Every structure is written in structure tokens, then in C-alpha cells.
Amino acid sequence: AAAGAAPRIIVKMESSAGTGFYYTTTKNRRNTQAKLELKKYDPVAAHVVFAAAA
Amino acid sequence: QLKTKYNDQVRPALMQQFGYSSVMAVPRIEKIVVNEGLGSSKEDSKAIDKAAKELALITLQKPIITKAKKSISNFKLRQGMPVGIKVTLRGERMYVFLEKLINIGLPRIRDFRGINPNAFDGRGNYNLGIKEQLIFPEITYDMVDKTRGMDITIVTTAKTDEEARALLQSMGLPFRK
Amino acid sequence: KRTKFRKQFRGRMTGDAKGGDYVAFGDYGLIAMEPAWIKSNQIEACRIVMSRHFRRGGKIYIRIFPDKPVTKKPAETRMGKGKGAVEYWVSVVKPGRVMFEVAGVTEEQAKEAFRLAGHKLPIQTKMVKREVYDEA
Amino acid sequence: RRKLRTRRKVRTTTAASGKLRLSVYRSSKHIYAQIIDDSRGQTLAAASSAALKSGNKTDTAAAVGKALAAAAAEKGIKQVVFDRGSYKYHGRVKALADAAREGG
RNA sequence: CACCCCCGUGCCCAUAGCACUGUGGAACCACCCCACCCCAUGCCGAACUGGGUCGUGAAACACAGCAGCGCCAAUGAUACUCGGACCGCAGGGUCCCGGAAAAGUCGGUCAGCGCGGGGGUU
RNA sequence: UCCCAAAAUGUAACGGAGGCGCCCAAAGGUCACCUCAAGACGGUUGGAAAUCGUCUGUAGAGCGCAAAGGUAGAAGGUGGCUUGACUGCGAGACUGACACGUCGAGCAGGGAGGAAACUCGGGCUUAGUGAACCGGUGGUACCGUGUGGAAGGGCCAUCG
RNA sequence: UCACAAGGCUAAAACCUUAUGAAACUCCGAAGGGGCACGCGUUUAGUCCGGGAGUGAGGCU
Ligand SMILES: [Mg+2]
Ligand SMILES: [Mg+2]
Ligand SMILES: [Mg+2]
Ligand SMILES: [Mg+2]
Ligand SMILES: [Mg+2]
Ligand SMILES: [Mg+2]
Ligand SMILES: [Mg+2]
Ligand SMILES: [Mg+2]
Ligand SMILES: [Mg+2]
Ligand SMILES: [Mg+2]
Ligand SMILES: [Mg+2]
Ligand SMILES: [Mg+2]
């Protein structure tokens, strides 16, 4: 996207599984400031819960 | 509490004075309604701490924080902020707090020959808000800071204004003369 | 004369005049015959004309009104770069439509003050008297 | 106001779901639970309570909810969709439910 | 639905609406009564809701009266117009033949059709 | 996006106004619940406007921003739980010269709210975007040159 | 919704009688126009697949 934009930074969601997987979305960073905990699917099994990876 | 049976001293006080068809057809009093509307200017956490303690000790009931109706006039106004506080009192606690008034509020009034007897709600109801806070059985200067004031509105199922007039008055109310 | 605030700009078209082809407000009334345009000054003209004639002062009803912005480009440019700034204002008077109503004067005053009025306009005209009675 | 009743009334997508509407009127101490094909403007069950209830008041629930579901199972009507109106689904009409939810 | 009438519910989305008004109580509805817990209030049994009456017909609801308002709305006639032709430098206008409103006037109307239920006709 | 655009879609102009290159972790999924702008009267600070009260009250408001269409039986306002802002797909159509683009029932794995029938593969919608190429990165074990390995490459993902 | 002619009336804003203009107003709203069907009654074209193109400056009522 538009590089020097500090709010709504695009970061991915890596599974707690270790399947080898990742989603990709955008938090406002005027919000979370720590990380993100979401509950998405995972082809390499069924239902993981993801940590907002660096 | 007893003001219940007093209402029931009124029930045929006017069912025998007027000429009604029935006993439910004579003006009851749904809710007393208190508005602690500081607002416009006063935007301190402390004056709503105070309005809260005050309201919750005088009427023994939690206060609802009424906000800015998105009205943002030329002066100091905006959107989501406390510009009025509210406590609706109905039935039981209504009769209790109203008795707190006629018993320990109305005489306590510094300078008081009764209150405004001009036609209120043209539909035949009432309001009456009143300034002063230093005329109370609960509001103490030894438990507050500076001086505030209340704004009250009582609802009466009267058809016209003379009938509310009569109602409120025979219930224990001074109309200044 | 001119108006207060608006849209800004325009266009044009014709075909006969809606209302109101009737003699209200007055006893005597002057009526257009041609699908003209009419301007702020073109009417202020007749204002000041008839208002000369009636003295002090009659009762004068300007049933028309300029609302149309007409433009002219800056003189001497080749077209393009824009539409013309607003030159002047126009009342789009169509025929049978009545422009002037007066009373509070007599028949002679209507004839003459209307004559002098109509000698200031791009239109042949007929003056008359009431009877148009669909609604007073 | 009305709002709530007409709200649920339309969230019962009238006929298009295929099934059978199941009315109620727990706002008085005489109720009326009904059964409708709504498309066809007709009623097919009918468990009143005004022709002698039992004696109970909101205990009557499970009972006219058992009477209804009985008249249903008798008619043949083997499938539910639960209309209401101004009702929370929690207590009384919820009883009517549970004992209709296994009662026909 | 056997006759009225009330309770729930639909087709119909104002000729079906509102105000003024009179009838209406154990026969259904409603208000009413109380609520420590179910359950609920951004505060309060006001509302959602749990206990059950008398009481009231007042309020709300239902019915009937009612043309003051809203709603609906002709025929005639016109605007405009398909397609035939034409006039004026032009802004625009006409003729023949069909289609043809809008708004206004005449008026019209307190809807009309169902299903099930309860309840009465010494 | 709106007229211009001649009541179908479409249509030019250095014609007439205005807006986008984001925002939202709740402003989404579900579940439940609430109703608006104003004017009149009457009311402690106030007193044009604040707060409360009542009578009016189908939209005269609200929708994160542009307007048009839309909307009160909610898309508007408030809470409970929540990660359907989900992989594997795609019946059938809208649209475009192509490339694109747009909508979508239904099936599977597997979930979320409801008690349920259900609803959901982002937001009322239509702007919030950049084809290839070369390269970064997380998987993957298809290719790897006499052979078995590794470089490198391919595929899914994705970043500039 | 923006505009605006007179007059009422009040403290002017509203609102009443009288009154009108609108591409970006719309309680209303044609004539025509388009899709689908039928062919009830005529006429000839259409559509697909494959070969060869040219044209892509238009002009007037
Ligand atoms: Mg012609
Ligand atoms: Mg003709
Ligand atoms: Mg005709
Ligand atoms: Mg009636
Ligand atoms: Mg066309
Ligand atoms: Mg072209
Ligand atoms: Mg290249
Ligand atoms: Mg790699
Ligand atoms: Mg490798
Ligand atoms: Mg009409
Ligand atoms: Mg070219
Ligand atoms: Mg050309």
C-alpha cells in the first residue's frame, strides 16, 4: 500500500498451530498497540486462533 | 408511604366534589422526574461526582447522565458529553421523596409563601423546578462544596389545568397568596 | 431586479406561457405578445417610467421577475476555457403571460403609463381589464 | 411500540421458509397459541384456554402447549416455526415452548 | 362462524386515515394490585416481566354516528405528441390524423374479503 | 455522484456543481432491544440553542466522508457473545473491443450468534485503485543436468 | 429544495389569503421508447464456423 502511512498498518496473522500459515490484514494501531487475537480457519487442520505476527 | 392512603383520602375528595363516573378516572401522578442539568459550561469530573452523590443520597436512586443532543452551538458545545443529569422517581419512591419534600423540604425553604400557581402544562399537568439547594433534609453544606439547584417536573393525568391545580393542592401543596 | 443567492448558470427553450394570465391586484393590466427574455434594467425601466407618470403614486404590480443568469464570454477570446461569467439577469416572459398590473389610477393613466412602458420593450403588447376569473 | 410484534412477524419470512407459523398471545391471562400456513389465509391448530383452563395461570403454559402440540400431532402437522409478537421468550411462553418443543 | 360479539391472525398497503363524538364490562381486552427471587431498567415493575384478585369502562382497545380535514376522483376542454404536411431571416408558430395527461370542477367514501377460537340468543 | 442525456442501457464538449487514493478490531457476524428533526407551553445553572417535562410529530432527521437512489416492520440509536473481514468451489447471469470488473443460489470441511426457523465467505450500495516483469518473505518437496544430495527454479501464499 | 410578486400578522422567523420561476425541484405525468411472448398475417432476412479485406478526417438540411 502507501508506504509512509503509520495508522492502519498492514500486518499478517500467523497461526499458533505452526502449520506454516498466515492471514493478512490491517489494525489501526490507534487501538491494539500490543498485538491481535483472532479465530480463523486453517486448511492444514480445522480452526487455530492466530497471533498478529511481526 | 402513608401518602398512599392520602391519595386515597383524595380519591373521593374529588369523586364527591366533582361528579365523576369512576375512581380510576381521577388524576393520578405518574413519576416526579428530577433534572440535575449543570452543563452548557460546567465540564468537571468533580461536579458530576457531586451531582451523583447528591442525587443518589437525596432520592436514594442512581442518576442517568443525559448527554449533548449533538447540539454544538457557537459557544462551548459538542456531541458526546454530560449536559444534564436525570433521575425518574415513580410510584413508591416518588411518594417517599415527595413526602421528603412537603415534610422536610417546603418549610426549610428560605423565603417561602408557596409556589407558582399560574397555569402550567396547558394539558393540565405540572412542572416546577426551583433554584436553591440550601433548603434540604439531605443536601448538606457539611457534605457538599458550593451551591447548586434542582429542576423537577411532576406528571398528572388531569384533563385540564384546574383539575391538576386542585389535585396537587389537596395533596399537600402551597400555592402562594 | 437581481436576486439574492442561487445556482449560477443556465440554458434556453420556448413554447407558450404557463400562468398567470389573469388580472389580480389591479383593475388594469398589460400583457406580452412575444416569447421574449427580459432584463433587470429592462423592467426597472418601466418601474421608473410608469412611476413617473402616476405621480404620488398609484399602485404598481410588476408581475414579472428576472431569475435567469445570461452570460457573455470575455470579449475577444476564442471559445473554450469556460462558460461566460454572469453578464446579466432575465425574466423569460412568454406570450399571453401578463407582466404589469396597475390600478389606483384611471383608464387614461393605464393606457398612457402602459404605452410609455411598452415603448421600452422588445415586444408588441396589449393592455386590458379583468374578467379572467378562474381564481382572483 | 407495535414495532416488536411486526418485527418478529416479518422475521417469520411469511411462507417462503416452507414451514408453519406458531402464534401466541401471553399478554393477558387468556392466551391463544395458533397454527398457520400463513400463505393460505387459514388456521390449522387451536389450543385456547377460555373454555376452562385448569386453574393455573402461567403454569398453564406447558399445558395449552401440550394441548396444542397434541392437536397438531393429530392433524399431521409435524413441523414448527415459532411466531410471537411482543414477547421475550423466557418464562411463560418459553414453557409453552419446551412442552411444545417435545409435546406433539 | 347458526345469529350477534369479543380474542388472536391474514389478503388488502388512506375511497381503508385523523380529529369531534356516543355505546362498551365480568365477556373477552385493558388499566389496576404486588414483586425477595426468575426476568428487566445505560437510573425507576414506566417497559420487558414473574403472583393474582376485586375494583374501573374511565385511559387504551372495539363498535357505531360523523363529510370539518385528509384520501380518492369524472365527463368536457387543453397542454404536450406519434406520424402526415407547412410558414417565419430568426426567437417561434400553423394544418390533417390518431394517442393524450397534469391541476381544477362533478363527485365518491368512515373500507372490503378470510381462517380459527372463546362467548352469549326464557 | 449529479444534471446535460431527447421518460429503456448508452452518448461529446477546455459544458454546468462536487467528491476519492481512506476509514472501521467495532463502524463487521449473530442475538436482543430502543426511534427521529424540529415547533408550542412550562420549567435551577440556562433562559436564541443547553438539561428535564408534556401535546404535536412518516421522515421537516439519521447513515464516518460526495451527492443520488435508498431507508422507520431499519440500513438509523444501545448492549450480549463474537472472528464468516474463512479455506476448497462455483449453478447461472449483469458488464466490457480485449483484458477487467459486478452480483450469486447451492456443496463440502469447519465454525459464530439464536432456544429456534435461521443468518454470515466484510460494512445501505455505487469512489477509496496499478496488468506483466524483475526481486523480498512464509510454506511446499514438482524440477535439479552420470547418480544421490544442496544452489537455483516451480506451485500456494504474500510484501515492493 | 433554492428562488421570488403583493398583502396579512406578530416580535421579523413561522403561518394565512393572493402569486410564480427552475438543467442539477418533483403530489402528479403522456406521446413515444425498450425487453419478453405470440405470429393470430405479411415479408424476406437472420445466426454460426473458416478465408480476404478496407474503413478508423466526415459533410449539409
Ligand atoms: Mg410533425
Ligand atoms: Mg388532436
Ligand atoms: Mg383519448
Ligand atoms: Mg371510526
Ligand atoms: Mg432515449
Ligand atoms: Mg460519440
Ligand atoms: Mg520488461
Ligand atoms: Mg522461496
Ligand atoms: Mg530450495
Ligand atoms: Mg389530487
Ligand atoms: Mg485515429
Ligand atoms: Mg460526427
Give the domain extent around A43: 1-54
64-83 of chain D touching strand E, CB 7 A cut-off: none
* Contact between C63 and C98 (Cβ < 8 Å): yes
**Strand F contact with B167 (CB < 7 A):** no
Sign of the Cα torsion A36, A41, A44, A46 reads positive
Instruction: State the amino acid at position A22 in one-letter form.
Output: Y
Q: Which residues contact C106 (CB under 8 A, 6 or more apart)?
A: none
**Strand F contact with A16 (CB < 7 A):** no
Which residue in A22, A4, A1, A3 sits closest to A13, CA to CA?
Answer: A22
Query: How far does residue A50's CA lie from ligand 9's centre (Å)?
Result: 27
Which residue in C19, C13, C45 sits closest to C122, CA to CA?
Answer: C45
- The owner of cell 451551591 is B147
Structural domain tally of chain A? 1
**Is residue D66 packed enough to be buried (19+ CB in 10 Å), middle (13-18) or exposed (0-12)?**
middle
> CA–C1' distance C76–G33 (Å)?
44
Domain ranges, ordered by start, for chain B: 1-177
11-30 of chain C touching strand G, CB 7 A cut-off: 11, 17-20, 22, 24-25
d(CA D103, CA C22): 80
CATH code given to domain B1-177 = 3.30.1440.10
Which subunits sit against A, judged by 3+ Cβ pairs under 8 A? none
CATH number at residue D73: 3.30.420.100
Grid coordinates given for B39:
452543563
**Strand E contact with D36 (CB < 7 A):** yes
C123 three-state secondary structure:
coil
Q: Does an H or E element contain B163, and which?
A: helix B161-170
Q: Specify the CATH class of C18-136 in words.
A: alpha beta
**Strand G contact with C37 (CB < 7 A):** no
**Strand F contact with B121 (CB < 7 A):** yes
Residue D3 lies in a domain: no
d(CA B30, CA B127): 12
Q: Which long-range contacts (CB under 8 A, 24 or more apart) does D47-55 make?
A: D47/D71
Q: Does an H or E element contain B67, and which?
A: strand B64-67
CA angle B33, B35, B41 (to 5 degrees): 170
**Strand G contact with C133 (CB < 7 A):** no
Give the domain extent around D27: 11-104
Query: How far does residue D1's CA lie from ligand 4's centre (Å)?
Result: 22
Nucleotides on chain G within 7 angstroms of protein Cβ? 2-6, 18-24
* Contact between B66 and B28 (Cβ < 8 Å): no
Q: Which residues contact B86 (CB under 8 A, 6 or more apart)?
A: B33, B34, B35, B36, B63, B64, B65, B66
| Elucidation technique | X-ray
d(CA C32, CA C54): 21
Structural domain tally of chain D? 1
Nucleotides on chain F within 7 angstroms of protein Cβ? 13-17, 21-26, 32-35, 37-38, 41-55, 73-74, 82-88, 109-112, 115-118, 129, 138-140, 157-160
> How many alpha carbons lie under 13 Å from residue A17 in its C-beta half-sphere?
21
Residue D26 lies in a domain: yes
Backbone angles phi, psi at C37, to 5 degrees: -125, 165
Backbone angles phi, psi at C45, to 5 degrees: -50, -70
Residue D1 lies in a domain: no
d(CA B7, CA B19): 18
* Ramachandran region, residue C80 (left: φ > 0; alpha: ψ -120 to 50; beta: rest): left
CATH number at residue A33: 2.20.28.120
